Design a protein. Structure first.
Lengths: 348, 348, 348, 348, 348
């Protein structure tokens, strides 16, 4: 019994779509959904998607309000569609997937993920919903998340953090660390050994290790001494070189966060989307040092130190592949006389 | 149980809103309403109104599909709103009235015309719908149409023609001639004795009298001779003077229709709406004779001859007030030596 | 080397996309594509589709300019996508199919119809293009058109008419009659024995048989006498009953065309798309007789006479399934005392 | 002498509409009003309303720039329209009322509030403008604000705060505390005894009592001890329970402000408008505790303590009505064994 | 004292901008200008231009309503801007020139054509307006039209036809044949000896010579015999070859008009603008013969016969430059054994 007026009633009264009966008067003007509240129009939704305004409104109302995997993880695992839910991409202000299964009549390719149209697609299954672990078992392609153990299936421990209504957090009142399972052409995959990005903000950056606490509190030369990082170019890669017109290094989010406490800078997110590696056009406000494409990754400083210290420093230029968020991230490693010159997530 | 998807289901399956249950998938993109038919979007409605697209769609679906009074009559009678129906203005491609009573939740000022908000508005009542003659009796202001007599109420015989789905016609299978009643401040008002405009097109103009048949067949001089119209300036007023840069006269639709059979002309409808008198920026294609504001009225030629022959031709300039479509239309009558020079529907 | 400026250069210089090199300055304002010609913007395309303006522009430029099957035939045969071409739907002013194969980077689901994503879709193949008969042989699902025989494949002779740039015609300088082939799940399907709709207009209707010439010339009673159609309700079904408020019958396009020569009527195409059976909200201008859903089919009068004369007239109400344009069209046959009362393409 | 170019001249030169003569060149592109300043377009106004761009621009230019009652007060008092001013709703970025009286030709229902169309509407009168106290005296329905005493009328002391150009403040250089008067059908109303919401922000929250200073400085168990609030569920209602997946309580703005100093949270304002009680979809970033509909009221903690301590705690579930901002606010009071379990502003 | 409300008042009351004082309430919604007429919005203008809606509305209201040169002539003469008028392009529904001089504050580059910014632009001057012949004399660049002689200036007799409000006509009540003058870099230029295109429609085509009357009446073979056109390929060039998939010839409008009387065809105007030579994607409905780029010129058949009979037929391929509408139109002349094979307005 789906309608625009019922989706709007649910938004107004329940904060989101909750399957409740009722209708509120709605008006659609351009890309905005309004509702009449005491004779005046109140904005309910501004469409930032490439879908029709009323269709995007319904998918946003029908979004998953439980902690879900971050869109970058789902993309890295090859998820095409979700089973009977909408994973809302809060970085793009749009649905994470083109089509739905049992969600919205306009976007639905099927009502149940058992339909033969879903067989070639990697369907996302949520073990927290009844029957979805069995639906994954029967599906040809899919990704499954669970809070606990699945009989006979070997798990992949995912990241500590998940997205709850666009807030990335490590849950204390809710579980955010999931077990991951993947099936390709009916065969359960052995998910690779992986590092995870920490998904922190520059504004509210918090250290998650004694090494990260020491990076933010110590001076550059004290930290590099304490952690035996001489010859690993942390001055360039992590701290950043602001002495020339082209900003040197600055590829770790912790280094950007440290810089941010002292002086501000403009980070232009020219491709605004969730990804393991982010690219910014950075302009340092203090010096005027800038870089059009400054690739930034948020790895735990210990994990980045482990990666850089596990590389052969005998070649001038070399690609270093690292599994991060289940995807293969290529890095460019540049050395001279057995010491690191630069190390950065490889641009195109 | 009103919804956008239900209004669209009714349009698709019933040709208009018919109160049927069901929903079709709808998408709204800009000012157009689409529906998915076999995987592709099919346009159902293009909003040409100043109302939100979904609101205008519902009012158009909920339009009156019975022969109704032409919008010019309703306007001339001071109608502000209709009771539990939508009079669709096909000349403006929009609802004839801003608000509704018991039609659409967005535009509704009341559910029943008995609500105190309707008391100061001239509500249109349709005696063909049960209980509407009683609602007119209780209404402080209103206009009533009926197919027969209402005990005690003195009728006004309206025009022969009515509008059925945008087609103005004199009904043969349906009744289009109504009795008119009006109330101002609780008091039934006597509607004036009036002429009616014939509501004809220039393209499909058909004569409705032997005088009109003779105007279209006889040459200018033999028609003026046959009907004793010498000294009444029909050469200027009805036939039109195309000899100078400013187009002379041409204020009767029959004269424009006669001209149209010999040579074409541009009629620019700069205020596109239904009205007793229409204004056009006319450009004669043959001669290049033009007039920015050429007021045109479609009176039966006999009725126009009666009006012009009932005037005193002894004054140079005089306003002549004639009741047409229940409204007083001022004409400007210009005479010299007891003969008409010009007679035209008075501008501004 | 695809670009908006190159697609626009091809439109301006070649009349459509022709793979020519070059660029013209383009501006996009709202849903319109303009080009600068001597300092002023000239409109190249108005987007009437639900796709982005630049994407719809490219698909329209890349439209098939050879005589192609009419969209109603393709839909009736279950075509989902075309192989390396765009079938443009001139009734909807939009692409006939959502996605493309090797046409446009934005709409492409594949570059070649051999990609596993195309396997479950009924791909349209054109035997007039090199390698497409082979691609049909390899396709899991598909519809093939050819100008001659394909060794081993049993053909279905299609309609005489095809669509060349939106003009439906029976080709004299070009071939418009194709052989049809269909495959469902790797298996070549036998297309049914079918009648074809004639695809004529009400305005430019031309008779295609001596029976059709006699329907338009002879009066109702002498046509029914000459062709022994007494008791088959042609007075109601084909000629139409305009005596009551609800318009009776009028389900054959030839009957509407005959009526159109005497007096005009409004046909409201509330679902504007190509289909075997069309639904119109009809208002007869002469009488005021109207019908919200008047289903109209354009069959050759001989074919309609054959269908109605091949029915058992001994039951009060019965569904009659007739294959027209490869699809099964249900009719409702109503009889009384061994005579037809009504016969109409069954609604909903 | 009202024009778009004159309204724009006033905005550019006076900061708002000031009745000054002059014109600036204006361009309208979609929902934005621009002005040419030295050959380039400078944005003057982005329309966030459901009114036409030029009409909304004029109403915003003609907004009241004196401290006015907050829109939530006006709505609670039943104000329909303002007399010869525009109360701009800065929460909705739109006019607070549909129509105007003597403001804008497009929205005006009358030029003077003495017109019979205004008689049934509750017109807002400002005693600070000459003759408005007399206009209220003569009006059938209305709300009057004054800075001082009105002869013969008994006042209602309103809130300390008013809105000056969207900034809610307790005036020091201007008077923001008004006397309120209301008339219904010619009869001056006895306005009810009421509490007022404090209209504070979460970001710039400031305590307005020693109890509020102690709530923010003391620990939970110290405050509940000092103010004898044991058994009143302040731990749940005011402090908030973040231990479970559903966020417990958190219905007072002071409690949200206290939480905000320690850790951040997402408050989703799904119905963005001014109201006595606000509803937010809250997600606690630290714990992942969330609630789709968390009703929040900003009462002075002393006023909330007075309300909760004046309730009978002997029933399991009970509705408690409290007059806040002249409106009746229903609360849900849940008790067990003579102690409060929860107390919250009642959702639908 | 220019305003949107005053431009709209002039449109409503005068049919166009007439410098009259007054204002009407206006609303702008998207690309449409509306006015309130008795409580409802009536559309005044739909913007089809790339200028802001209110700016395009003012330029259309301020359009030249006197017979003016056709836009193709102005373009061929290199006109960039008009002096104190707007030449409205009715083929593009937009101003013919980007900027104005003394017309609209938004588009104005100057108030008087004597401003140094106008010196490098070819300004159009109208000798029918006081002081414009003098402004042409002082102009560095310009085109002047006059109804009579200008002392000392050698005239160019222009075409018989001009455009009066979008209607191209040879004036009888107005003068449409002008004297043309041009200045490049202060120097009066001698305009070439030229043919003129006749500016006729396919629908309302009328012959303008005994040769043109004979082309439309006589069969192909007897016209070619009567006018001694054997060996000049009129069968291909003028009559058109519809026997093959590619439509042969058909480059003269009279030939298209003759064809149009027997059977219809689609002419796709892919570059919709006024030009000496027009390009159409033509599809013959009868045969299915088509051509993506069919260049069509409307020359008087006598003028085309004179051009083709004045060519040397001894070379296989040759470019023939003919002056038409003051511009040099290149034709491609193809011969074999002393006879014409084809002659067409040379593409790209």
């Amino acid at each position: 019994a789906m309608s625009l007026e019922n989706v709007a009633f649910n938004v107004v009264n329940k904060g989101h779509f909750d399957g409740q009966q009722g209708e509120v008067p709605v008006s659609i003007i351009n890309n905005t959904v309004y509702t009449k509240v005491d004779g005046v129009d109140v904005e309910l939704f501004e469409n930032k998607t490439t879908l029709p305004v009323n269709v995007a409104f319904e998918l946003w109302a029908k979004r998953n309000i439980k902690p879900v995997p971050e869109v970058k993880i789902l993309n890295n695992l090859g998820v095409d569609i979700a089973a009977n839910t909408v994973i809302w991409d809060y970085k793009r202000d749009a649905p994470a997937h083109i089509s739905t299964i049992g969600v919205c009549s306009m976007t639905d390719i099927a009502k149940k993920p058992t339909e033969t149209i879903c067989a070639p697609l990697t369907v996302f299954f949520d073990g927290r919903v009844d029957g979805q672990v069995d639906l994954f078992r029967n599906a040809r392609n899919g990704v499954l998340i669970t809070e606990g153990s699945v009989k006979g299936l070997q798990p992949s421990v995912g990241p500590k953090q998940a997205s709850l209504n666009g807030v990335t957090l490590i849950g204390e009142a809710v579980k955010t660390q999931f077990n991951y399972y993947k099936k390709v052409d009916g065969v359960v995959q052995q998910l690779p050994e992986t590092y995870f990005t920490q998904s922190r903000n520059l504004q509210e950056f918090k250290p998650r290790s004694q090494m990260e606490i020491d990076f933010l509190e110590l001076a550059m030369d004290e930290f590099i001494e304490r952690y035996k990082l001489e010859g690993y170019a942390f001055e360039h890669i992590v701290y950043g070189d602001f002495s020339h017109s082209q900003l040197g290094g600055l590829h770790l989010l912790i280094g950007l966060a440290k810089r941010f406490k002292e002086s501000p800078f403009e980070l232009e997110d020219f491709i605004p989307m969730d990804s393991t590696v982010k690219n910014y056009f950075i302009t340092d406000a203090q010096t005027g040092s800038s870089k059009c494409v400054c690739s930034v990754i948020d790895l735990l400083l210990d994990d980045f130190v482990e990666i850089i210290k596990s590389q052969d420093l005998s070649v001038v230029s070399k690609v270093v592949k690292v599994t991060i968020d289940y995807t293969e991230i290529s890095f460019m490693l540049w050395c001279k006389d057995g010491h690191v010159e630069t190390f950065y997530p490889k641009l195109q």
